[PDB]
Ligand binder design. Structure first.
Ligand SMILES: C[C@]12CC[C@H](O)C[C@@]1(O)CC[C@@H]1[C@@H]2CC[C@]2(C)[C@@H](c3ccc(=O)oc3)C[C@H]3O[C@]132
Ligand SMILES: C[C@]12CC[C@H](O)C[C@@]1(O)CC[C@@H]1[C@@H]2CC[C@]2(C)[C@@H](c3ccc(=O)oc3)C[C@H]3O[C@]132
Lengths: 204, 213, 213, 213
């Protein structure tokens, strides 16, 4: 039994209503008792899943009133009536109709904005240098060096979500300190959502 | 630093037996404790790492275990070529620290020495010196008494002894005894004798020569 | 409630080695309704084992659950390198249904002190009205390192964000970045910026600093 | 197929400086942390210092920390140890070693002996040991060299079975050792037997044939 969610990512202004759909490849309505064997989960970065709903619509203990699933048979829905900062997370549906619990692929939920990136040189007073990619939304950003010519000794760190509701990340490369006078180092930041590429030369 | 304490400090064991070495840490080091074999005349060599994994070309009679503060090195079916000193060592910290070491000795049977005596070489006499050398080879146990006599009378000054380390093949010992004299004194006496006293016989092993023959 | 406590938090093994993850229950789990989940980076969870010891359909040979009531293990008998990820236990005998905090399998490799660097904020960033200071820990293991900002010798608190890479595909190390963010207004109120790094592989902390101009 | 070759081992005056060099071959050098270890006469192993692959890092015990400098040249594939304010405690033989990305210390140089004594360098005189007239024993006495060590072989290392090379003895600020070899009685003097002595400290080599009297 396969669970398909949509949308895959969801941007909804703070306090607004947010809606996620889940469809099963087979009916998970159990003819004999009239129950849906469907559950909903919340998962925040670096944490286990949190059971929110099961039997399609029943709220688990200590799940806030604003969380409410609905629908039955093959098509289901989780709605967050009043979206708050703390509700920003990944949501899965799960079928337990058959001893083979399967989850949807999941849905990311976040706050709207839509901005391009800002790039600044990380350069100090083997040497290290780098790029700081600041204040961009939404994910994702891809960073290369000298249009993918330089890859040895590169580290590009995972993005973090700032208080702003905007993302920031760093990319760094260690190079021969002797070469800083002669060979060019350019970081290439591609932000497909804002329809932008930015190439920042980083100097010593 | 982290203190690694090994026990026992020595182990004397018959061929074919188990030896168990333990190493204890002043604090938790998790996996990161490791065992080195060092044979005489050679550098240390890695054998067990991450307390339990075998480094390659290590025979599988060698084995380790442990976690946190308590770790062990085991040889099952000890044999002659394993004669070595063993060390534990921790990577979970800084500085990285080695244990005190455990010297392995092989128990076996008794063996009387092969005794050979040598007058000074003409090369040494040409340059004005005189050394008498006595080799006592492949004997057990290690405890032995060598004595020098010139014209039947005992001589202790100018004698220099050295023991080889117990053998990697046959687990025997060997000894070199060097009596250095002035060429003056060498030519002043005739009969030179090397006497070995060892538990394998009540009658001492005597080897000799006469200078003027 | 039944609280499930996973041990250890992170288990360090090489591919080929067997792993034993533990799930300890505060309160007896009825009918051994104890389930194990795999979760890989950027993927929804995967049922591995249910009923303490029943392998789900489509799950390979090497995953097996053991134990009853309060003591449960997941054994991964012959580790594939794709298998190094998060594993959750979860009980369905009694409400409310809650997850173990998780065990992450990572690849073991010696111990490596970080290569540290610090970066002042660029002129372009200061003109835009914000000051981000970056401290870089390069190619270290294990992941446990303490990063402390000192601004005019004053230990900072909760105005800095750390980002850490996935374990490296060549040498199995991590890199880490800490970014201290102040307004231009506030950044220009202090002279000396320092990140002090404590790591297991260092004898003592290494400090990296700059004075503005 | 890996080789680490130490050089610079020998005598030094107290209070002076010493540099060791280690040349590594048969492994991607610029991909590895490299370490020095030393072993005193008393046989205890003492970790000294390490380097990450960019010389942009070090790991050294306090004890020494502010006394020696560790460094390396990638392109030249060589490792270096600078000692300053040299003392009694620094008299040891020094080991070069790889640090290893999945295995602590799998590779050790043979080790280079460092001696701290105002004593003057001296080459040995080499004297053969032949009988006064089943198996026959021969030897040679290597007298009056400084400092340690020498390397002694028989028939350029082709005779290594049935050889006993004895530990040196220090006498009037000069070392003396002997070495013995046992062959079947009909082999000598019918076939030629030569002992070969290299003394790296004086850059000399002597091949002394054993002569019937
Ligand atoms: C295997 C299972 C099948 C349906 C789900 O897809 C998965 C399941 O694992 C969930 C739970 C499981 C269900 C089978 C039936 C149950 C054991 C049932 C029950 C019946 C009699 C009794 O005395 O006590 C309990 C109530 C619920 O616990 C059940
Ligand atoms: C959603 C779920 C939550 C906890 C698990 O991590 C996943 C889960 O999908 C397993 C299955 C599911 C569980 C919720 C509770 C169950 C419905 C439970 C039950 C209770 C009363 C009853 O009358 O019939 C069955 C027994 C088991 O079937 C349960």
């Amino acid at each position: 039994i396969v669970m398909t969610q949509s949308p895959d990512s969801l941007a909804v202004s703070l306090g607004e209503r947010a809606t996620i759909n889940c469809k099963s490849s087979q009916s998970v309505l159990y003819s004999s008792n009239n129950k849906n064997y469907l559950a909903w989960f919340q998962q925040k970065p670096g944490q286990p899943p949190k059971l929110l709903i099961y039997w399609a619509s029943l709220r688990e203990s200590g799940v806030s009133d604003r969380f409410s699933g609905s629908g039955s048979g093959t098509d289901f829905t989780l709605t967050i009536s009043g979206l708050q900062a703390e509700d920003v997370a990944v949501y899965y549906c799960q079928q337990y109709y058959s001893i083979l619990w399967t989850f949807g692929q999941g849905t990311k939920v976040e706050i709207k904005s839509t901005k391009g990136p800002s790039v600044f040189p990380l350069a100090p007073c083997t040497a290290a240098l780098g790029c700081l990619v600041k204040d961009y939304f939404p994910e994702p950003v891809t960073v290369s060096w000298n249009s993918g010519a330089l890859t040895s000794g590169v580290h590009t760190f995972p993005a973090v979500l700032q208080s702003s509701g905007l993302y920031s990340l760093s990319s760094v490369v260690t190079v021969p300190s002797s070469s800083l006078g002669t060979k060019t180092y350019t970081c290439n930041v591609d932000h497909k959502p804002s329809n932008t590429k930015v190439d920042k030369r980083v100097e010593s | 630093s982290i203190v690694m304490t090994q026990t026992p400090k020595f182990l004397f064991v018959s061929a074919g037996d188990r030896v168990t070495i333990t190493c204890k840490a002043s604090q938790s080091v998790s996996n990161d404790v490791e065992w080195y074999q060092q044979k005489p005349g050679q550098s240390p060599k890695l054998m067990i790492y991450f307390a339990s994994k075998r480094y390659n070309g290590v025979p599988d009679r060698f084995t380790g275990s442990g976690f946190g503060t308590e770790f062990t090195f085991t040889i099952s079916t000890v044999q002659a070529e394993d004669l070595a000193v063993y060390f534990c060592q921790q990577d979970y910290s800084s500085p990285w620290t080695f244990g005190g070491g455990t010297k392995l000795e092989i128990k076996r049977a008794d063996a009387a020495p092969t005794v050979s005596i040598f007058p000074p070489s003409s090369e040494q006499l040409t340059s004005g010196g005189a050394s008498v050398v006595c080799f006592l080879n492949n004997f057990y146990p290690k405890d032995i008494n060598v004595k020098w006599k010139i014209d039947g009378s005992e001589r202790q000054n100018g004698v220099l002894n050295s023991w080889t380390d117990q053998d990697s093949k046959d687990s025997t010992y060997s000894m070199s005894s060097t009596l250095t004299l002035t060429k003056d004194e060498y030519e002043r006496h005739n009969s030179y004798t090397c006497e070995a006293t060892h538990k394998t016989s009540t009658s001492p092993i005597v080897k000799s020569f006469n200078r003027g023959e | 409630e039944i609280v499930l406590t996973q041990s250890p938090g992170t288990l360090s093994l090489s591919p080929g080695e067997r792993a034993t993850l533990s799930c300890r229950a505060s309160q007896s789990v009825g009918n051994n309704y104890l389930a194990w989940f795999q979760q890989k980076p950027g993927q929804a969870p995967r049922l591995l084992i249910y009923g303490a010891s029943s392998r789900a359909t489509g799950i390979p040979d090497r995953f097996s659950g053991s134990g009853s009531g309060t003591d449960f293990t997941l054994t991964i008998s012959r580790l594939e390198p794709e298998d190094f990820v998060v594993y959750y236990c979860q009980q369905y005998s009694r409400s409310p249904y809650i997850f173990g905090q998780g065990t992450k399998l990572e690849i073991k490799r010696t111990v490596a002190a970080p290569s540290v660097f610090i970066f002042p904020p660029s002129d372009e960033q200061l003109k835009s009205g914000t000051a981000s200071v970056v401290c870089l820990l390069n190619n270290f293991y294990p992941r446990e390192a303490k990063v402390q900002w000192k601004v005019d010798n004053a230990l900072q608190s909760g105005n800095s964000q750390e980002s850490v890479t996935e374990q490296d595909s060549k040498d199995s190390t991590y890199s880490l970045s800490s970014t201290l963010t102040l307004s231009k207004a506030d950044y220009e109120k202090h002279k000396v910026y320092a990140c002090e790094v404590t790591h297991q592989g260092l004898s003592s902390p290494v400090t990296k600093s700059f004075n503005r101009g | 197929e890996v080789k680490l070759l130490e050089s610079g081992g020998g005598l030094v005056q107290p209070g002076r400086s010493l540099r060791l060099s280690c040349i590594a071959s048969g492994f991607d050098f610029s991909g590895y942390w490299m370490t020095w270890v030393r072993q005193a006469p008393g046989k205890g192993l003492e970790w000294i210092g390490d380097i990450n692959p960019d010389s942009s890092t070090i790991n050294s015990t306090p004890s020494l920390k502010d006394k020696v400098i560790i460094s390396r040249d990638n392109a030249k594939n060589t490792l270096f140890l600078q000692m300053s304010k040299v003392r009694s405690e620094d008299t040891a033989l020094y080991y070069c070693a790889q640090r290893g990305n999945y295995v602590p210390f799998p590779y050790w140089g043979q080790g280079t002996l460092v001696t701290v004594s105002a004593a003057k360098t001296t080459p040995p005189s080499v004297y053969p040991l032949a009988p006064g007239s089943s198996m026959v024993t021969l030897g040679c006495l290597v007298k009056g060299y400084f400092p340690e060590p020498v390397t002694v072989t028989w028939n350029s290392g082709s005779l290594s079975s049935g050889v006993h090379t004895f530990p040196a003895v220090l006498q009037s600020d000069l070392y003396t050792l002997s070495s013995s070899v046992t062959v079947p009685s009909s082999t000598w003097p019918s076939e030629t037997v030569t002992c070969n002595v290299a003394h790296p400290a004086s850059s000399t080599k002597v091949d002394k044939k054993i002569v019937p009297r």
